[PDB]
Amino acid sequence: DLSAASHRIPLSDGNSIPIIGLGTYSEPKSTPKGACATSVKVAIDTGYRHIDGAYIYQNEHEVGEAIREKIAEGKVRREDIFYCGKLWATNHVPEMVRPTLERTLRVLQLDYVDLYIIEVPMAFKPGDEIYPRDENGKWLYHKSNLCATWEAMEACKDAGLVKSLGVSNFNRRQLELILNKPGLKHKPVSNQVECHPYFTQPKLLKFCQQHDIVITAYSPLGTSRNPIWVNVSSPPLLKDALLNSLGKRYNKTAAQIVLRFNIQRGVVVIPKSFNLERIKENFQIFDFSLTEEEMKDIEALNKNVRFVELLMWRDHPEYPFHDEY
Ligand SMILES: NC(=O)c1ccc[n+]([C@@H]2O[C@H](COP(=O)([O-])OP(=O)(O)OC[C@H]3O[C@@H](n4cnc5c(N)ncnc54)[C@H](OP(=O)(O)O)[C@@H]3O)[C@@H](O)[C@H]2O)c1
Ligand SMILES: CC(=O)[C@H]1CC[C@H]2[C@@H]3CC[C@@H]4CC(=O)CC[C@]4(C)[C@H]3CC[C@]12C
């Protein structure tokens, strides 16, 4: 059903999303300027039609430059590209939502985004500082009001500034608060969370399927394993013995196996790479498939251990990972 030329799956609001996209987060202080822009252009030339980014990644402008250059080149039309942007924790106050989205539209120099989502369910103190803390280093929070924030997001879609609305890092309870709100106009069509063979998200995936919510798997290759912040106590996903053995069966790498695993499952994947060769490699997942047995072999690798724990915010009232799911 999925092919390199046609691989967009349906969203509940009538729109669709390419099952594979290019992730764009990269350590600001150590990433050479221009690397993102170059990588997005390579991705589009390769066949990618979905790009995932965020204003807080510090390189959202590079994503826009690349997209606009390829449209000017005649390679693709605006309607052929799918961009996802995100609303950070410091911008949850209802009145700040549209203004924040409009800032991202100026940065990209585009009229609308295809998908805009609430980055985390936790509200932080408003301000320029993306990671606000007081003199004693204590995190500065704000009282969350997910429904009020959602109503502001719905207004953005009515204004034509975004085609689809979704969320990220939301657990079952949080999704239900929005799903059951009186006067709901646009239900969430997507929930972006960490997902790969070591954290398969069995119960959250099933809840989302029952409500027609598509899951987008972030850190689909297990993260960059940056010792500065990743939970590296859990082993390197791409070096897994089984995943590598399965790759030898089809002459594919472990990375290609884990990506095929999720897409064949109806789960969107957004692997990040700023390397020419690897950007190409990740897209070659439509010329083979995994047997029903192999899908079960992979599902069994689940350790229920997150690479992205966000332990520094476990004290926030809306921290999403205390619950089972
Ligand atoms: N919603 C959220 O809160 C949230 C959180 C985390 C991430 N995300 C999104 O999800 C995207 C993907 O997640 P991620 O960046 O954390 O990690 P990831 O995609 O799981 O892994 C990226 C790392 O793998 C390397 N890599 C890429 N392709 C490879 C291949 N074929 N073989 C070997 N290594 C390969 C990359 O290096 P090279 O670049 O050198 O290839 C990089 O170090 C992000 O960029 C971002 O857009 C969202
Ligand atoms: C409090 C911290 O140590 C910061 C520095 C690194 C930040 C992480 C970078 C990767 C992604 C980026 C996002 O989109 C939000 C979630 C993380 C995990 C981000 C969390 C804040 C960190 C750990």
CSV table of N, CA and C in Angstrom, one decimal, residues 211-320:
chain,number,residue,atom,x,y,z
A,211,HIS,N,-9.5,6.0,19.0
A,211,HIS,CA,-10.0,7.4,18.9
A,211,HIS,C,-9.6,8.1,17.6
A,212,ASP,N,-9.1,7.3,16.6
A,212,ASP,CA,-8.7,7.8,15.3
A,212,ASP,C,-7.6,8.8,15.4
A,213,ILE,N,-6.6,8.6,16.4
A,213,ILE,CA,-5.5,9.5,16.5
A,213,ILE,C,-4.3,8.8,16.1
A,214,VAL,N,-3.6,9.4,15.1
A,214,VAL,CA,-2.3,8.8,14.6
A,214,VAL,C,-1.1,9.2,15.4
A,215,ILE,N,-0.3,8.2,15.7
A,215,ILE,CA,0.9,8.4,16.5
A,215,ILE,C,2.1,8.7,15.6
A,216,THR,N,2.9,9.8,16.0
A,216,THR,CA,4.1,10.1,15.3
A,216,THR,C,5.2,9.7,16.2
A,217,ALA,N,6.1,8.9,15.8
A,217,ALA,CA,7.2,8.4,16.6
A,217,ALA,C,8.4,9.3,16.6
A,218,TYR,N,8.7,10.0,17.6
A,218,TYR,CA,9.9,10.9,17.7
A,218,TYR,C,11.1,10.0,18.2
A,219,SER,N,12.3,10.4,18.0
A,219,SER,CA,13.5,9.6,18.3
A,219,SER,C,13.3,8.1,17.9
A,220,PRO,N,12.8,7.9,16.6
A,220,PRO,CA,12.6,6.6,16.0
A,220,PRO,C,13.8,5.7,15.9
A,221,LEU,N,15.0,6.3,16.0
A,221,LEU,CA,16.3,5.5,15.8
A,221,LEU,C,17.0,5.4,17.2
A,222,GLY,N,16.3,5.9,18.3
A,222,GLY,CA,16.8,5.8,19.6
A,222,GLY,C,17.6,7.0,20.1
A,223,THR,N,17.5,8.1,19.4
A,223,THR,CA,18.2,9.4,19.8
A,223,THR,C,19.7,9.4,19.4
A,224,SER,N,20.3,10.6,19.5
A,224,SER,CA,21.7,10.8,19.2
A,224,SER,C,22.6,10.3,20.4
A,225,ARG,N,21.9,9.9,21.5
A,225,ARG,CA,22.6,9.4,22.6
A,225,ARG,C,23.6,10.4,23.2
A,226,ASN,N,23.3,11.7,23.1
A,226,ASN,CA,24.2,12.7,23.6
A,226,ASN,C,24.2,12.5,25.1
A,227,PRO,N,25.4,12.2,25.7
A,227,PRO,CA,25.6,11.9,27.1
A,227,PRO,C,25.2,13.1,28.0
A,228,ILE,N,25.1,14.3,27.4
A,228,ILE,CA,24.7,15.5,28.2
A,228,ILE,C,23.3,15.4,28.8
A,229,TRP,N,22.4,14.7,28.0
A,229,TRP,CA,21.0,14.6,28.5
A,229,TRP,C,20.2,13.3,28.3
A,230,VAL,N,20.6,12.5,27.3
A,230,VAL,CA,19.9,11.2,27.1
A,230,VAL,C,20.1,10.2,28.2
A,231,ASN,N,19.1,9.3,28.4
A,231,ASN,CA,19.2,8.3,29.4
A,231,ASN,C,20.0,7.2,28.7
A,232,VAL,N,21.3,7.3,28.7
A,232,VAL,CA,22.2,6.3,28.1
A,232,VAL,C,22.4,5.0,28.8
A,233,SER,N,21.7,4.9,30.0
A,233,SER,CA,21.9,3.6,30.8
A,233,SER,C,21.3,2.5,30.0
A,234,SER,N,20.4,2.8,29.0
A,234,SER,CA,19.8,1.9,28.1
A,234,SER,C,20.7,1.8,26.9
A,235,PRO,N,21.0,0.5,26.4
A,235,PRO,CA,21.9,0.2,25.3
A,235,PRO,C,21.6,0.9,23.9
A,236,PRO,N,22.6,1.0,23.1
A,236,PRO,CA,22.5,1.6,21.7
A,236,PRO,C,21.5,0.8,20.9
A,237,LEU,N,20.3,1.3,20.6
A,237,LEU,CA,19.3,0.6,19.8
A,237,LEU,C,19.8,0.1,18.4
A,238,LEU,N,20.6,0.9,17.7
A,238,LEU,CA,21.1,0.4,16.4
A,238,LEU,C,22.1,-0.7,16.4
A,239,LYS,N,22.6,-1.0,17.6
A,239,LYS,CA,23.6,-2.1,17.7
A,239,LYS,C,22.9,-3.4,18.2
A,240,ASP,N,21.6,-3.4,18.4
A,240,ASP,CA,20.9,-4.5,18.9
A,240,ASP,C,21.2,-5.8,18.0
A,241,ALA,N,21.5,-6.9,18.7
A,241,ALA,CA,21.8,-8.1,18.0
A,241,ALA,C,20.7,-8.6,17.0
A,242,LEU,N,19.5,-8.7,17.5
A,242,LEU,CA,18.4,-9.1,16.7
A,242,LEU,C,18.1,-8.2,15.5
A,243,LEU,N,18.0,-6.9,15.8
A,243,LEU,CA,17.7,-6.0,14.7
A,243,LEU,C,18.7,-6.1,13.6
A,244,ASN,N,20.0,-6.2,14.0
A,244,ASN,CA,21.0,-6.3,13.0
A,244,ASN,C,21.0,-7.7,12.2
A,245,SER,N,20.6,-8.7,12.9
A,245,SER,CA,20.4,-10.0,12.2
A,245,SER,C,19.3,-10.0,11.2
A,246,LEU,N,18.2,-9.3,11.6
A,246,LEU,CA,17.0,-9.2,10.7
A,246,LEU,C,17.4,-8.4,9.5
A,247,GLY,N,18.3,-7.4,9.7
A,247,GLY,CA,18.7,-6.6,8.6
A,247,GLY,C,19.5,-7.4,7.5
A,248,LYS,N,20.3,-8.4,8.0
A,248,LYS,CA,21.1,-9.2,7.0
A,248,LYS,C,20.1,-10.1,6.2
A,249,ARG,N,18.9,-10.3,6.6
A,249,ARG,CA,17.9,-11.1,5.8
A,249,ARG,C,17.5,-10.4,4.6
A,250,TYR,N,17.4,-9.1,4.6
A,250,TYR,CA,17.0,-8.3,3.5
A,250,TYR,C,18.1,-7.3,3.0
A,251,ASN,N,19.3,-7.5,3.5
A,251,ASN,CA,20.4,-6.6,3.1
A,251,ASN,C,20.1,-5.1,3.4
A,252,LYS,N,19.6,-4.9,4.7
A,252,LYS,CA,19.3,-3.6,5.2
A,252,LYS,C,20.0,-3.4,6.5
A,253,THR,N,20.1,-2.1,6.9
A,253,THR,CA,20.7,-1.8,8.2
A,253,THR,C,19.7,-1.9,9.3
A,254,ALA,N,20.2,-1.9,10.6
A,254,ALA,CA,19.3,-1.9,11.7
A,254,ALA,C,18.3,-0.7,11.7
A,255,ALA,N,18.9,0.4,11.2
A,255,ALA,CA,18.1,1.7,11.2
A,255,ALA,C,16.9,1.4,10.2
A,256,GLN,N,17.1,0.8,9.1
A,256,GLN,CA,16.1,0.6,8.1
A,256,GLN,C,15.0,-0.4,8.7
A,257,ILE,N,15.5,-1.3,9.5
A,257,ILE,CA,14.5,-2.3,10.1
A,257,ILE,C,13.6,-1.6,11.1
A,258,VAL,N,14.1,-0.8,12.0
A,258,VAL,CA,13.3,-0.1,13.0
A,258,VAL,C,12.3,0.9,12.4
A,259,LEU,N,12.7,1.5,11.3
A,259,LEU,CA,11.8,2.5,10.6
A,259,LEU,C,10.7,1.7,9.9
A,260,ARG,N,11.0,0.6,9.2
A,260,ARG,CA,10.0,-0.2,8.5
A,260,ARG,C,9.0,-0.7,9.6
A,261,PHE,N,9.5,-1.1,10.7
A,261,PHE,CA,8.7,-1.7,11.8
A,261,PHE,C,7.5,-0.7,12.1
A,262,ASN,N,7.8,0.5,12.4
A,262,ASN,CA,6.7,1.4,12.8
A,262,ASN,C,5.8,1.8,11.6
A,263,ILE,N,6.4,2.1,10.4
A,263,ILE,CA,5.5,2.5,9.4
A,263,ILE,C,4.5,1.4,8.9
A,264,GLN,N,5.0,0.1,9.0
A,264,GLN,CA,4.2,-1.0,8.6
A,264,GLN,C,3.0,-1.2,9.6
A,265,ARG,N,3.2,-0.5,10.8
A,265,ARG,CA,2.3,-0.5,11.9
A,265,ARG,C,1.3,0.6,11.8
A,266,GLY,N,1.5,1.5,10.9
A,266,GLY,CA,0.6,2.7,10.7
A,266,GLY,C,1.1,3.8,11.6
A,267,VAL,N,2.4,3.8,12.0
A,267,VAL,CA,2.9,4.8,12.9
A,267,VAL,C,3.9,5.7,12.1
A,268,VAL,N,3.7,7.0,12.1
A,268,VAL,CA,4.6,7.9,11.4
A,268,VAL,C,5.9,8.0,12.1
A,269,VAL,N,7.0,8.1,11.2
A,269,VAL,CA,8.4,8.2,11.8
A,269,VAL,C,9.1,9.4,11.2
A,270,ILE,N,9.8,10.1,12.1
A,270,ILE,CA,10.5,11.3,11.7
A,270,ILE,C,12.0,11.3,12.1
A,271,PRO,N,12.7,10.4,11.5
A,271,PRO,CA,14.2,10.2,11.8
A,271,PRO,C,15.0,11.5,11.4
A,272,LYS,N,15.9,11.9,12.2
A,272,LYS,CA,16.7,13.1,11.9
A,272,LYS,C,18.1,12.6,11.5
A,273,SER,N,18.6,13.3,10.5
A,273,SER,CA,20.0,13.1,9.9
A,273,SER,C,20.4,14.3,9.1
A,274,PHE,N,21.7,14.7,9.4
A,274,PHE,CA,22.3,15.8,8.6
A,274,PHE,C,23.4,15.3,7.8
A,275,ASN,N,23.4,13.9,7.6
A,275,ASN,CA,24.5,13.3,6.8
A,275,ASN,C,23.9,12.8,5.5
A,276,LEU,N,24.6,13.2,4.4
A,276,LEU,CA,24.1,12.9,3.0
A,276,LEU,C,23.8,11.4,2.8
A,277,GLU,N,24.7,10.5,3.1
A,277,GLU,CA,24.4,9.1,3.0
A,277,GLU,C,23.3,8.6,3.8
A,278,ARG,N,23.3,8.9,5.1
A,278,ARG,CA,22.3,8.4,6.0
A,278,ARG,C,20.9,9.0,5.7
A,279,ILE,N,20.8,10.2,5.2
A,279,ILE,CA,19.5,10.8,4.8
A,279,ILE,C,18.8,9.9,3.7
A,280,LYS,N,19.7,9.4,2.8
A,280,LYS,CA,19.2,8.6,1.7
A,280,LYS,C,18.8,7.2,2.3
A,281,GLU,N,19.7,6.6,3.1
A,281,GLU,CA,19.5,5.3,3.7
A,281,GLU,C,18.1,5.2,4.4
A,282,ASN,N,17.8,6.1,5.2
A,282,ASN,CA,16.5,6.1,6.0
A,282,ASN,C,15.3,6.1,5.1
A,283,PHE,N,15.3,6.6,3.9
A,283,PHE,CA,14.2,6.6,3.0
A,283,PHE,C,14.0,5.3,2.2
A,284,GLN,N,15.0,4.4,2.2
A,284,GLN,CA,14.8,3.2,1.4
A,284,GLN,C,14.1,2.1,2.2
A,285,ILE,N,12.9,2.3,2.6
A,285,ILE,CA,12.1,1.4,3.3
A,285,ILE,C,10.8,1.0,2.7
A,286,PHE,N,10.7,1.1,1.4
A,286,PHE,CA,9.5,0.7,0.6
A,286,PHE,C,9.7,-0.4,-0.3
A,287,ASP,N,10.9,-0.9,-0.4
A,287,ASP,CA,11.2,-2.0,-1.3
A,287,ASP,C,11.3,-3.4,-0.6
A,288,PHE,N,10.8,-3.5,0.6
A,288,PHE,CA,10.7,-4.7,1.4
A,288,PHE,C,9.7,-4.6,2.5
A,289,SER,N,9.4,-5.7,3.1
A,289,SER,CA,8.4,-5.7,4.2
A,289,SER,C,8.8,-6.8,5.3
A,290,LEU,N,8.3,-6.6,6.5
A,290,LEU,CA,8.6,-7.6,7.5
A,290,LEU,C,7.5,-8.6,7.6
A,291,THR,N,7.8,-9.9,7.8
A,291,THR,CA,6.8,-10.9,7.9
A,291,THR,C,6.0,-10.8,9.3
A,292,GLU,N,4.9,-11.4,9.4
A,292,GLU,CA,4.1,-11.3,10.6
A,292,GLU,C,5.0,-11.8,11.8
A,293,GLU,N,5.8,-12.8,11.5
A,293,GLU,CA,6.7,-13.3,12.6
A,293,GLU,C,7.7,-12.3,13.0
A,294,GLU,N,8.3,-11.7,12.0
A,294,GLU,CA,9.4,-10.6,12.3
A,294,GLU,C,8.8,-9.4,13.0
A,295,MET,N,7.5,-9.1,12.8
A,295,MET,CA,6.9,-7.9,13.5
A,295,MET,C,6.8,-8.3,15.0
A,296,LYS,N,6.5,-9.6,15.2
A,296,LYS,CA,6.4,-10.0,16.6
A,296,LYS,C,7.7,-10.1,17.3
A,297,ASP,N,8.8,-10.5,16.5
A,297,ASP,CA,10.1,-10.6,17.0
A,297,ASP,C,10.5,-9.2,17.6
A,298,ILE,N,10.2,-8.2,16.8
A,298,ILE,CA,10.6,-6.8,17.1
A,298,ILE,C,9.8,-6.3,18.3
A,299,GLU,N,8.5,-6.5,18.3
A,299,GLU,CA,7.6,-6.1,19.4
A,299,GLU,C,8.1,-6.6,20.7
A,300,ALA,N,8.7,-7.8,20.7
A,300,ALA,CA,9.2,-8.4,21.9
A,300,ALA,C,10.5,-7.8,22.5
A,301,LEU,N,11.1,-6.8,21.7
A,301,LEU,CA,12.3,-6.2,22.2
A,301,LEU,C,11.9,-5.0,23.2
A,302,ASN,N,10.6,-4.7,23.4
A,302,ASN,CA,10.2,-3.7,24.3
A,302,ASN,C,10.7,-3.8,25.7
A,303,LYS,N,11.4,-2.8,26.2
A,303,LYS,CA,11.9,-2.8,27.6
A,303,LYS,C,11.2,-1.9,28.5
A,304,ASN,N,10.2,-1.1,27.9
A,304,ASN,CA,9.5,-0.1,28.7
A,304,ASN,C,10.4,0.8,29.4
A,305,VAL,N,11.5,1.2,28.7
A,305,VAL,CA,12.5,2.2,29.2
A,305,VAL,C,12.6,3.3,28.2
A,306,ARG,N,12.4,4.5,28.7
A,306,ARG,CA,12.6,5.7,27.8
A,306,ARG,C,14.0,6.3,27.7
A,307,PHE,N,14.3,6.7,26.5
A,307,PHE,CA,15.6,7.4,26.3
A,307,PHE,C,15.4,8.9,26.6
A,308,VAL,N,14.2,9.3,26.5
A,308,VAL,CA,13.9,10.7,26.8
A,308,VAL,C,12.9,10.8,28.0
A,309,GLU,N,13.5,10.9,29.2
A,309,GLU,CA,12.7,10.9,30.5
A,309,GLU,C,12.3,12.3,31.0
A,310,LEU,N,13.0,13.4,30.7
A,310,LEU,CA,12.7,14.7,31.1
A,310,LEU,C,12.6,14.7,32.6
A,311,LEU,N,13.5,14.1,33.3
A,311,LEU,CA,13.5,14.0,34.8
A,311,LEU,C,13.5,15.3,35.5
A,312,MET,N,14.1,16.4,34.9
A,312,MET,CA,14.1,17.7,35.6
A,312,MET,C,12.8,18.4,35.7
A,313,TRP,N,11.7,17.8,35.1
A,313,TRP,CA,10.4,18.4,35.2
A,313,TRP,C,9.4,17.5,35.9
A,314,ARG,N,9.9,16.4,36.5
A,314,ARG,CA,9.0,15.5,37.2
A,314,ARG,C,8.2,16.1,38.3
A,315,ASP,N,8.5,17.3,38.7
A,315,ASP,CA,7.7,18.0,39.8
A,315,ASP,C,6.6,18.8,39.3
A,316,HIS,N,6.5,19.0,37.9
A,316,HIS,CA,5.4,19.7,37.4
A,316,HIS,C,4.1,19.0,37.5
A,317,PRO,N,3.0,19.6,37.9
A,317,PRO,CA,1.7,19.0,38.1
A,317,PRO,C,1.2,18.2,36.9
A,318,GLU,N,1.6,18.6,35.7
A,318,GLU,CA,1.2,17.9,34.5
A,318,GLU,C,2.3,17.0,33.8
A,319,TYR,N,3.3,16.6,34.6
A,319,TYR,CA,4.3,15.8,34.1
A,319,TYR,C,3.6,14.6,33.5
A,320,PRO,N,3.8,14.2,32.3
A,320,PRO,CA,3.1,13.1,31.6
A,320,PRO,C,3.5,11.7,31.9
